[PDB]
RNA sequence: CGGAGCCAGCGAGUCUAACCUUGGCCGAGAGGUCUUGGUAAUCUUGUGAAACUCCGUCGUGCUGGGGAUAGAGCAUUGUAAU
């Protein structure tokens, strides 16, 4: 269940951070998993 | 005389080596007995993201043993905050 | 039916230059299970000579 | 092993519990032929009857057939407990039944 | 043969078998008879591998595959079936049993039986399916001797896998029967017959 | 059976519809004076040895 | 040049030591040996119906002499079988703990295995002596 | 101190570290004899770095092998490569250079895997 | 099928909670009991995985291949398992 911005479509439900794959790639440059290979 | 182990972790190698080398220089310039910077394996935390792609993260770890009184340990722990 | 299956083993094995697991069932008298019992029995007697032994196939030689 | 040879004396097809049994397979897999009896059931019955199960069903005396039938109508008296039987904890009687072949 | 006794005893059978110049447990690679001159350069096994089980990377170059040991290459094409993918040790023991059988079936040189079955079951010429203008005829091409080795090993493994399936007779006995009936042309094996079929289609279609 | 022994001397390229067959110039092994043009299915490098059956057959081109 | 378990083959050691335990008979052997298969990942009980328990104990004692200590779950992991689930593929299934407990109580009652304060079944020095002696006798079978 | 050479030998994440000291002529792999390798088929493969040179090269040395990782075939190739490497390293560092060249020539002419590490790794699966 | 041998690596793990669990006893098992270790290259973990190796049972017979379907009970998570 999306507890951030009501965005259930594509939750990343792993580890309870629970961001949708749209907004996960919005906030991808705040955590640190970025493009290496 | 307290024996304290400092376990340092970082994502980038240059600042972590700088912090470790500053610990070595300052604990060497006033005669503290110590173990050298033990360099743990860099753990590679990865996520397979939707063919498929891979997101990576390198995490580097050192630890340094020190034997020092309370004043020197507190001043070292306060100043080395970066 | 004991004396008209068993001794044909004792005629055929010295005839055949090569005696193994399934070149001894082929005589169409016996099953494939008791054939290996007859193999070990001829090992003990001496008409069968061991070449190599595996749990699924065992190579022998006449005497 | 030792080739133990028998001058006839074996029957081709036996009949037990009103059902034909082929007297050429192992006794486990010859008593598996009848209904209500599988592999491990005939195996444990003939181990309680101490039957040599590497012997075929043609080399089996009818006294051991009587022992097997006695374990059929008495499974729970011969140290084969309730987990091993067909109809455990019934509703009609509250007992444990092993439903046999032609009695279904 | 001047034994050297160690504290960990390397046993007497192994010291006798590999101190004396026999290049297997019972066999030798010094006795290898190749008939065809084209098959001299593509069968070559002269290095004594006492198990005939190697982690070969022979499949990167087309010429390197010819330097795969043909005992090992036959062992590799034994590992063809879907139940057997990734089972080379099984086929090595199959080869060891088979060489034992070819010993006991009065062929003192079973490796020469293998090489002669390679030679006598290779279709020299075959047909390809040319365009031909609609009604596609088949034209006799003269297949390469490396492909003749490939083709003979493929036909032998296919015939042995056909014969050993759905019978009591083992893979080693069927494969030994095929190698003995195919080491000298007898038309009771598989690859002799199919070699003859491919060559008669080639001769009919040149 | 006439077993023609042959020598690859000159490769001509890759032909066939599928691009699989090879035109090969052949020095005949028993008699040097014969130079044949043959069609080979399979991998062939220079100075290889072939086993033909007819030295006299020559095919112009393929499709 | 010590004659010990480390020099003999695996199955030969298990056969010999199980034969010595059968001819001795001085262990704790239960009554559900003819009833109970060694693991839930099996269809049939073991074929050595009067003597698979001694084979089990020989495997256990050999597995204990070679290492520091064992448990019950470790020997459940060791025996583990690829179990068919009908239409589903095979999966790893550990064995029963009761066979492990009764084997270790049978070999601890005779004074061969013993509980070590790391919570583990280790080989006793009398058990070390006995297994090395019967391994020496297994080597003397080969002369 | 007993003169010993410590030398690795690797095969497919299977590392067998070998300790070739001056001993009785004793060979152990994981505290188990070289007579007893866990596959029966690959057994003579472990004998391939042994009989390719000879057996009087071994009476002077007690040989240790301790293994981590791998499979069944991988550990066999690891231990035979480690035996060859420890043997030629003993005959390099303590024994003269020429005998080391003879042992390395005997190993190289038959199987270069026994002296040179392998490369057939599983690739990264190309995302 | 019945025994034996027992070979890896990527991960992942609990706080203001019940995560990963070692071990010991009970139970045919499912599982249960009692604890203990690990917030982690430390404990689980050497994850003793499976395929594999060997030896015995089977003997080509919809067979001892198959396991779909169905009956009976027993346990586990979940308020509630039809």
Swiss-Prot record, chain A:
Zn(2+) binds at residues 2, 5, 20, 23. GO terms for cellular component: cytosol; cytosolic small ribosomal subunit. Binds 1 zinc ion per subunit. Its cofactor is Zn(2+). Disulfide bonds: none annotated. One of its GO terms (molecular function) is structural constituent of ribosome. Belongs to the universal ribosomal protein uS14 family. This is Small ribosomal subunit protein uS14A.
Curated annotation (Swiss-Prot), chain D:
Signal peptide: none annotated. Keywords: Acetylation, Cytoplasm, Isopeptide bond, Methylation, Ribonucleoprotein, Ribosomal protein, RNA-binding, rRNA-binding, Ubl conjugation. The keyword Ubl conjugation applies. This is Small ribosomal subunit protein uS13A. The lineage of its organism: Eukaryota, Fungi, Dikarya, Ascomycota, Saccharomycotina. It is found in: Cytoplasm. GO terms for cellular component: cytoplasm; cytosol; cytosolic small ribosomal subunit; mitochondrion; small ribosomal subunit. The keyword rRNA-binding applies. The chain holds residues 2 to 105 of 146 of the full protein. Present with 48100 molecules/cell in log phase SD medium. There are 2 genes for uS13 in yeast. N-terminally acetylated by acetyltransferase NatA. The modification N-acetylserine is found at residue 1. GO terms for molecular function: rRNA binding; structural constituent of ribosome. One of its GO terms (biological process) is endonucleolytic cleavage in ITS1 to separate SSU-rRNA from 5.8S rRNA and LSU-rRNA from tricistronic rRNA transcript (SSU-rRNA, 5.8S rRNA, LSU-rRNA). Component of the small ribosomal subunit (SSU). Mature yeast ribosomes consist of a small (40S) and a large (60S) subunit. The 40S small subunit contains 1 molecule of ribosomal RNA (18S rRNA) and 33 different proteins (encoded by 57 genes). The large 60S subunit contains 3 rRNA molecules (25S, 5.8S and 5S rRNA) and 46 different proteins (encoded by 81 genes).
Swiss-Prot record, chain E:
There is a cross-link at residues 26, 184 (Glycyl lysine isopeptide (Lys-Gly) (interchain with G-Cter in ubiquitin)). GO terms for biological process: cytoplasmic translation; maturation of SSU-rRNA; regulation of translational fidelity; ribosomal small subunit assembly; ribosomal subunit export from nucleus; translation. The keyword Cytoplasm applies. N-terminally acetylated by acetyltransferase NatA. The keyword Coiled coil does not apply. CDD domains: uS7_Eukaryote. One of its GO terms (cellular component) is 90S preribosome. GO terms for molecular function: mRNA binding; rRNA binding; structural constituent of ribosome. Keywords: Acetylation, Cytoplasm, Isopeptide bond, Phosphoprotein, Ribonucleoprotein, Ribosomal protein, Ubl conjugation. It is found in: Cytoplasm. Belongs to the universal ribosomal protein uS7 family. Component of the ribosome, a large ribonucleoprotein complex responsible for the synthesis of proteins in the cell. The small ribosomal subunit (SSU) binds messenger RNAs (mRNAs) and translates the encoded message by selecting cognate aminoacyl-transfer RNA (tRNA) molecules. The large subunit (LSU) contains the ribosomal catalytic site termed the peptidyl transferase center (PTC), which catalyzes the formation of peptide bonds, thereby polymerizing the amino acids delivered by tRNAs into a polypeptide chain. PANTHER family: RIBOSOMAL PROTEIN S7. This is Small ribosomal subunit protein uS7. It comes from Saccharomyces cerevisiae (strain ATCC 204508 / S288c). The gene is RPS5.
Swiss-Prot record, chain G:
Component of the ribosome, a large ribonucleoprotein complex responsible for the synthesis of proteins in the cell. The small ribosomal subunit (SSU) binds messenger RNAs (mRNAs) and translates the encoded message by selecting cognate aminoacyl-transfer RNA (tRNA) molecules. The large subunit (LSU) contains the ribosomal catalytic site termed the peptidyl transferase center (PTC), which catalyzes the formation of peptide bonds, thereby polymerizing the amino acids delivered by tRNAs into a polypeptide chain. GO terms for molecular function: RNA binding; structural constituent of ribosome. This is Small ribosomal subunit protein eS19A. It comes from the Eukaryota. Belongs to the eukaryotic ribosomal protein eS19 family. Its main location: cytoplasm. The keyword Phosphoprotein does not apply. Present with 29000 molecules/cell in log phase SD medium. GO terms for biological process: ribosomal small subunit assembly; ribosomal small subunit biogenesis; ribosomal subunit export from nucleus; translation. Component of the small ribosomal subunit (SSU). Mature yeast ribosomes consist of a small (40S) and a large (60S) subunit. The 40S small subunit contains 1 molecule of ribosomal RNA (18S rRNA) and 33 different proteins (encoded by 57 genes). The large 60S subunit contains 3 rRNA molecules (25S, 5.8S and 5S rRNA) and 46 different proteins (encoded by 81 genes). It is found in: Cytoplasm.
